[PDB]
Every structure is written in structure tokens, then in C-alpha cells.
Amino acid sequence: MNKEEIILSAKNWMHSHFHDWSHIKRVWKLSKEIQSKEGGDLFTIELAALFHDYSDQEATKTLINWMETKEIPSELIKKIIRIIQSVSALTIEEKIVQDADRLDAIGAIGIARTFTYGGAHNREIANQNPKNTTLQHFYDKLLLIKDQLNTETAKTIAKEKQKIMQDFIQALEKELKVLE
Amino acid sequence: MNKEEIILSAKNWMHSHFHDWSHIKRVWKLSKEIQSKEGGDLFTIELAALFHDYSDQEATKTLINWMETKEIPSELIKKIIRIIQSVSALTIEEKIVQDADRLDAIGAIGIARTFTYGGAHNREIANQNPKNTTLQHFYDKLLLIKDQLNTETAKTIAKEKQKIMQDFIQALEKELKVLE
Ligand SMILES: [Mg+2]
Ligand SMILES: [Mg+2]
């Protein structure tokens, strides 16, 4: 099996099947970056990352098929699938991908993504008088993600993100009541 | 006519009729703040601000009615309506309200509002390879608003906003391609 080629194929396959594709390719780039400092089977990581968002049980069986057809030892297929499960006792590969996923939920992308999501489920931006307001989602989940990360590399590439997010929030609650 | 009371009534009427109510009350608070430094008929401003978002020709005729019923000289009704038109040769009152409206389109609120809007019209967050991406809306309109403002007071209460917005954008385009 030619790893470089298989990756390329998987990449082109997911692309012509798509949040959007932009999201996947980010989790892919992100997990790639993380491994270069946390180690692990890069090939096993790169695919789990690219397929982490396809399972939404036939879909799963479809991937296995596509993978057996590529002649990937059934041992790798097993790991790759096990990883996808811990995403959407953890091996580093399962940690990396899961970290790369969470990382794309916070920071500037997080803000944009979470507010775009709210705009498709009628979730009030905020509400001083906060049970389901998007703003509260930042205090309940988002802001907490940065710490739940299970990788130091992931944690440092989360720093700049956890910052702008913090600044964004401060600025929101401030101009959300008009203070001056 | 009791101005303080009429304002209260208009306030309670728009409230039980609602972007959401949060938006109107902000444009109201915002225009109030601005006038305290730019002058103008506060009463004429306060109502145009509260009704600036109701015209969406019967609606217009409904307001006039509600206003004549409050015994507001037909001269004020005229101005108040003229203002609402320049919002959704400009007197300062028309400038203030229009400034207060634009102000709520940028800054943290802007980001949140524009991304929530995109999430209800399927507007891709961004796209490096930008004709309709929400990101581009920042370069085409939003970022430009801060300068189109026709009031110095408005311009300074736009400073903090134009900043976080600038920071947010920088941070977006940066983590949108994963740079490190
Ligand atoms: Mg995902
Ligand atoms: Mg408005």
C-alpha cells in the first residue's frame, strides 16, 4: 500500500462529499501539526482525521470497505475506526485527532462556527435576564475546552485562540449593555 | 403630552412585539448616549430609534396613529418618520439614529450578528479560493462602517469596536489556514 497515495485519495474523496470541507481539512492540518510534536502513527492519524466526520453504521462499513480495497492491513483499519469513535485508555493517536477536533471549536473559528450554528437553530445571541443563549455556551463549553485538551502541543496552539475568544467575550458583554 | 410617559409606552409596545428586541433597545441606548454629546431633540431621537425597526406602508400609518393618539404635534410625527426613513441634507437627529444603528452592526455585536445572519442564509464562513463569504462582508461593509459614521461621538464609541473586530479578523484568517 502506498500511504502518500491513499491519503491523497481519501482527501479527494471527502472533498467531493462536503461543518463543510473547510472544517475537515482544518482538523486534518491541525492533527498533522500536533503529531509533529506529540508523535504517533501519522498515517493512522491523517485518515482518522479525514474520516472523523463521515459517520452521520453503513457509513462505517463503507469506510472499512474503501480501506480494505486500499489494502490497508485490517489492523490499521481497526485503529483508524477506534480513533474516529473516541472523537465524534486513549492512545496518543486518539488524543491528537480528538485534540485537533476540539481545537477547531474554539478561537476565532469557534466564535464564527458557534454563532453560525446558533443562526440555524434560533439560539438568541445573549440574554442578561442565559439558559440557552449562545453567549452562555462560551461559559459552559467552549472556554472550558482549552483545558480539557489532552496534549501540551494542542494546549499551546490553543493559547492564541483562548485569548481572542476571551477578548471577544469581554468586548461582547461590554457593548451588549452599552457601557460609557 | 407627557414625553417621559410616551417614551415608556413606546418602549413597552415595541418590547411586546419582538434582529430581536435586544437590538432595538441597544440602538435606543446608543442613540441616547450619542445625543448627550452631539445634541438634538432627545424625544424626537428616542422614538425614531425605538420605531426605526417596525417598518417591515400600513405599519407607517400605524405608528402615525399611535403617535397622534398620544397627542404628539403633527410636526414631531413628521420629523420622527423622516428620521426612520434615513435609517432603514441630514438633521443631527437623523444622523444620531442612523449612527446608532450602524454602530450596532460592527464590533463584537457585529461579529455575532453577522455570523448569526450567515447561519440563516447558508453563507459560508470563508473561502480562500471570497465573493459571498461572510469573511468578505467584513472587508466590503462592516470594516468600512466605522468611517462612514457621521458623528465624532459615534466615531469614538466605534473605536473599541473597530478594534476587536480587526483583532478578530486577523485571528480568523490566521487560524483559518493553520499557520505555525
Ligand atoms: Mg469535526
Ligand atoms: Mg436596526
Automatic annotation (TrEMBL), chains A, B:
Residue ranges annotated for the HD/PDEase domain, each copy included: 19-115
Signal peptide span: none
An example molecular function term from Gene Ontology annotations: metal ion binding
InterPro entries: HD/PDEase_dom, HD_domain
Superkingdom assignment: Bacteria
Keyword terms, alphabetized: Metal-binding
Residues annotated as binding Mg(2+): 23, 52-53, 101
Organism: Listeria innocua serovar 6a (strain ATCC BAA-680 / CLIP 11262)
Coiled coil stretches, renumbered: none
Organism classification: Bacteria, Bacillati, Bacillota, Bacilli, Bacillales
Keyword Transport: no
Protein name: Lin1889 protein
